Amino acid sequence: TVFSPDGHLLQVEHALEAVKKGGCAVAIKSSNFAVLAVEKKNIPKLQNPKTTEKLIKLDEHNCLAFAGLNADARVLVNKTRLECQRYYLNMDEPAPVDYIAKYVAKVQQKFTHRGGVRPFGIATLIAGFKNNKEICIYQTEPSGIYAAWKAQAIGKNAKIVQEFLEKNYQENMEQKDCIFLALKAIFEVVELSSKNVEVALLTEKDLTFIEEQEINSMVELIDQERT
Template sequence: MARRYDSRTTIFSPEGRLYQVEYAMESISNSGSAIGILCKEGIVLATEKKVISKLLDTGAVGCRREKMYKLDDHIAVAVAGLTADANILINKARLSAQQYLFTYQESMPVEQLVRRLCDVKQGYTQFGGMRPFGVSFLYAGWDEESGYQLYHSDPSGNYAGWKAHAIGANNQQAQNILNQEYKEDFTFRDAMKLALKVLSKTMDSTSLTSDKVEMSTVKYDEGASQVVFSYVSEEELDPLTAEVNEEGKAAKTD
């Protein structure tokens, strides 16, 4: 028998709040996949684009990027789940980062920013009348104390550091591929190729094309002494997607 959810009777009980967390996790599982990979040159973030209509004005505010956001000069996130919920948390994170910069005249450590945002997310699981944020984040950043860092947080407020991680649809299958093929000496190209391979296995599509993928990199430029966050263009992705598709076809024939 299907479980019937009545907000009037269950939202204030522990069971009701647990149900809300489960509902938030389900909304993440139904969203597009997001992949984060730590390599020796930096961090690669890749997500599946759900909206690829030719009618979409990609130059308009709010449409340039679907699931990747810059929080500060040294940290960015990839999102899986409800984008509207993500926008609220992203604004809070940006405000926290700027307040820290104003107070201490230096960038906020990556883990400290992650922890502060997770405190907000956890607070929404404690009380009746509020539902958890239905979104998971992959944080990619660099600071002087710990170098490159990749974190994942979920609606409950838990977070952990990873060398490679996948969230969103078919995340378990994606995680299995990362466990088998990830290597710590990866270059940017190796990490990008692995991210595309993982996306090709999790997407509901027969072939992978660059217009269905959103990818970015985080790298510390020693010459300029600053962290560089940049998006990978479709032209740069085309050779890699073609290579991944060819390898996939070869694997099927074998």
């Protein structure tokens, strides 16, 4: 990681292109909850679970959905959960999303600055809770920067899906209205089948998933919407 004559970086600019070749993930904020949605593709007739790659928990009130190198996410998450509990032991409070996002972004920033260390090729978006009952969907980067969005998407073609969110994002949606917003972003994923999306509804400090039969009743509405 050595500077260039124009001032830009090299590995930090290369690793940022590695997350572009990853599965699409999208998190949308609401009033008192934040429904997440990650789209991943597997091989049929084999690969028994969903592998639980994305929608990883970090604490009782946190939810991380990575994008990028599927192998490098476990090291950043296992180095996050180690600090998600080290904070709880040193501050007697559950780790707020303001400290976790400042930590995950510090791990990637600590690697691009060191000598002889490959930078992390992943970019996660953490959607947890602050000190009070406020939800702030953060979003890291392989460079180390982060910002508290309100709707964000990363992975394969993270620009047109981010553009769709700008078109119909209201202030405080309802439960099913906020899920339909993220579930309207299946235009980026091919064939729009239910075996590709895996949503997760984080709500009132109690993380829960959504069964496969509920996403079928919601993806079928897209067929009548795609005409």
